[PDB]
Amino acid sequence: MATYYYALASQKFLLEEEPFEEVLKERRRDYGEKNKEIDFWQVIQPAFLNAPELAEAKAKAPEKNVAIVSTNKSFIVWVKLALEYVLTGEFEAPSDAIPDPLASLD
């Protein structure tokens, strides 16, 4: 099991008002340059948020949501600093509650 860090926003905010697709893409390009394994993702309507131990974040979260997830904590700190309007946290996977950390409910 690895520790996954996340920043969670509403779909409206992270897909429409402040879309991150190019940020992620340019980061994939920098990783390709150095042959680094990709360790970050966008997950729309993440199934991780239905996990019993994230119930609090589920209560706080907008109904239609989306996360940037990464095993690199400092990336997520950077996303949080850049975006502001996000929930953040961490979890462990895979587990019974979180079989696939990247699974979408949508």
Residue numbers in the entry: 1 to 106
What does the paper say about this structure?
Mg-protoporphyrin IX monomethylester cyclase (MgPME–cyclase) catalyses the formation of the isocyclic E ring by cyclising the methyl propionate side-chain at C-13 to the C-15 bridge carbon between rings C and D, generating protochlorophyllide (Pchlide). Recently, the small monomeric protein Ycf54 was identified as a second candidate component of the MgPME–cyclase. The Ycf54 protein has been identified as a component of the MgPME–cyclase complex.
To investigate the structural basis for these effects of the A9G and R82A mutations in Synechocystis, crystal structures solved by molecular replacement against the WT Synechocystis Ycf54 were obtained for these two proteins to resolutions of 1.5 Å and 2.2 Å, respectively. Superposition of the A9G and R82A models on WT Ycf54 resulted in respective RMSDs of 0.19 Å and 0.28 Å over all Cα atoms, showing that there are no significant structural alterations between the WT and mutant structures. Upon closer inspection of the R82A structure, differences are observed in both the local hydrogen bonding network and surface electrostatics. In WT Ycf54, R82 adopts two clearly defined conformations, both of which form stabilising hydrogen bonds with neighbouring residues. In one conformation, R82 forms a water-mediated hydrogen bond with the side chain of W78, and in the other R82 forms two direct hydrogen bonds with the backbone carbonyl of F20 and the side chain of E17. All of these interactions are lost in R82A, which may alter the stability of this region. Examination of the surface electrostatics shows the base substitution to alanine changes the surface electrostatics from predominantly positive in WT Ycf54 to predominantly negative in R82A. It may be that the flexibility of R82, along with its associated positive surface potential, is required for docking of Ycf54 onto CycI and consequently mediation of the cyclase reaction. The structure of Ycf54.R82A, which has impaired Chl biosynthesis, ∼50% reduction in CycI levels and abolished interaction with CycI, reveals that the R82A mutation has reversed the normally positive surface electrostatics to yield an overall negative face. The rest of the R82A Ycf54 structure remains unaltered by the arginine to alanine substitution; therefore, it is reasonable to conclude that this residue is required for Ycf54 to form a stable interaction with CycI.
